[PDB]
């Protein structure tokens, strides 16, 4: 019997839909499989420990834990209550600052076994920059945009906004490279509306990035795997105005869905995940495919896209959980084989 | 006083160099203005703090070690034993266990002020098919490479081989993607070599780059800053073969150094670094430059390459670790000004 920890809440405010998230996997663990214990994180970064989770929680209240296993960090995620180490601990919050890659980086150099994606993947994903040069350089087709940092805007400000004008139609976003779902983006439809935008953003982060605006349908893929993964069939998120409603299988044409299941893959592969990403597109009326973005950590409740997404293809709430700690042994079992390997020819 | 510590030591291969650098850092830490307590990770793991360092380390013995304080992760890593927070953590290692970046998050959950590379950066960095697009994006030159999985290699090795012979000229260097320096590299002449170091590789890593290697001068540059970094003019190892004297600047024409100071800017921002960055190029007989890497952690004793580097543009050893002390302390203090102002809407 394997020991599991699931780690959530978080100091951003994302407290609750973690909360909620936990909840949903915590019920959808079968227990004579799975030893588990939680860990949650307040909004304090107060760390609180509940062992051996043993029944339905029929509540999210439940989980505002009051009280901790008293233990240090470091104790409370290098064994389980069962006193072995976790075969696999679920980060399913962001970084204390929203950030992602943070906790993954902590499990590391804790050595302990984690879901998900790592250090590189998780941080690529959650700096849009980043991503999109990724995704460029995989061949991914993308909406134009331009990017800088606040030092670059500083000094070429006429030239930056000749840049727009040249090569961006309005509207277009002026979004933060570096937060996930948050402020600082504003849609403009004009140079004044950009200007207004751009300042709005740099007090939030350093870098920017600006991108053409599109009518088009939300949809989403989910991959799971770490060296050979798969793609679902896309899923839709119907909305009449864009500023979960979801539609599954997405109502799009075979060789459509088949070539974003492909990009699914190559979005995955661009930005190095392990485990899972959900990968988001635009499509236009007339079936353009632009990536979005990937989301190296997506909803994830049983009503969820991701986890809906799986049922469809046959896979279950509970088989897609037990199929993600397996990954997650597996990728930890071959970083430290592959550890074994190198200090070998070293030695 | 401010309060500082250094990390160091550390189950990496690496351990040793680590040891040293933690004591040239140390003897350029001037006592009377910092408090500074520092911590040794064990090859087995394990971190042992010792407080106080209050005079100079004329020998690795007079450092405890693996008999410091054991010392359990916790919010405590912020504090200092003078019972003030630490105003700057060197992270004097690599990754422990994984890639680098990984103490840097350790870092960033506990709100521990640190020097250098962010997550990001130190991560991207240890990854040089992530550091390649990145710096193709940016528009740095690079020498031409090919890059794959495994799993592509497994299902797609004609191809492969194919894309080689026609876009790289031989030789080409067969690199693991991930891990710096280390096992697995093969210099190959031909295509049953290369399916060879290929083949080698792949028992160390899952991602490989191809490169076309080339005849050149290595040439290095340090940057230091975060939003307003500034490069040094570059500098070389003194050697009359390319297949530890340095000289500083480098014997390059005036209009070469300058591009190449410009060009580790770049590099900087491509990687989005924090603190520092030693930007490593090729340069060629006809002064063609090639960015061959960013190193988010360079050799950092007194005599190499990154601090003498800054030697010649008048900023001395301690001066160095001081600007880099405060550099964490504005960055971290812009972190902490920027999380407010996200999580007041
Ligand atoms: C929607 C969130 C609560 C945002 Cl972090 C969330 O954590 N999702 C999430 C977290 C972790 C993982 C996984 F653990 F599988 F890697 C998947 C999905
Ligand atoms: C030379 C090493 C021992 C290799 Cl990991 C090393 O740690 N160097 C190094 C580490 C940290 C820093 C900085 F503190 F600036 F981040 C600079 C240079």
């Known amino acids: 019997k394997e020991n599991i920890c699931i780690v959530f809440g978080g100091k951003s405010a994302e407290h609750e839909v973690s909360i909620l998230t936990a909840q949903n996997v915590l019920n959808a663990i079968d227990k004579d499989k799975y030893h588990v214990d939680i860990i949650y994180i307040t909004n304090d970064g107060d760390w609180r420990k509940q062992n051996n989770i043993t029944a339905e929680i029929k509540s999210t209240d439940e989980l505002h834990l009051e009280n901790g296993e008293a233990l240090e960090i470091s104790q409370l995620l290098k064994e389980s209550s069962s006193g072995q180490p976790y075969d696999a601990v679920f980060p399913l919050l962001h970084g204390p600052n929203g950030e992602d890659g943070t906790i993954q980086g902590l499990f590391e150099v804790l050595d302990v076994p984690y879901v998900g994606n790592g250090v590189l993947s998780a941080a690529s994903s959650m700096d849009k920059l980043v991503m999109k040069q990724l995704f460029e350089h995989r061949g991914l087709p993308q909406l134009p945009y331009i990017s800088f940092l606040r030092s670059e805007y500083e000094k070429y400000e006429h030239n930056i906004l000749k840049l727009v004008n040249d090569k961006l139609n309005y509207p277009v976003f002026v979004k933060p490279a570096n937060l996930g779902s948050s402020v600082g983006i504003s849609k403009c439809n004009n140079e004044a509306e950009l200007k207004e935008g751009i300042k709005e953003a740099f007090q939030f982060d350093r870098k920017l990035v600006i991108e053409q605006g599109v009518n088009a349908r939300e949809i989403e893929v989910a991959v799971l795997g770490n060296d050979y993964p798969e ?86 709430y509970p088989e897609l959980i037990t199929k993600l700690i397996e990954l997650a042994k597996e990728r930890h079992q071959d970083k430290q084989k592959n550890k074994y390997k190198i200090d070998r020819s070293h030695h």
């Open 231 to 316: 793609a679902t069939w896309p899923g839709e998120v119907v909305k009449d105005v864009a500023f979960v409603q979801l539609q599954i299988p997405a109502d799009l044409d075979e060789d459509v869905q088949l070539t974003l299941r492909n990009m699914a893959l190559e979005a995955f592969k661009a930005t190095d995940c392990s485990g899972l990403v959900r990968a988001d597109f635009f499509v236009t009326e007339d079936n353009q495919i632009y990536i979005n973005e990937t989301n190296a950590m997506p909803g994830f409740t049983a009503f969820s896209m991701y986890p809906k997404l799986w049922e469809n293809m046959g896979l279950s």
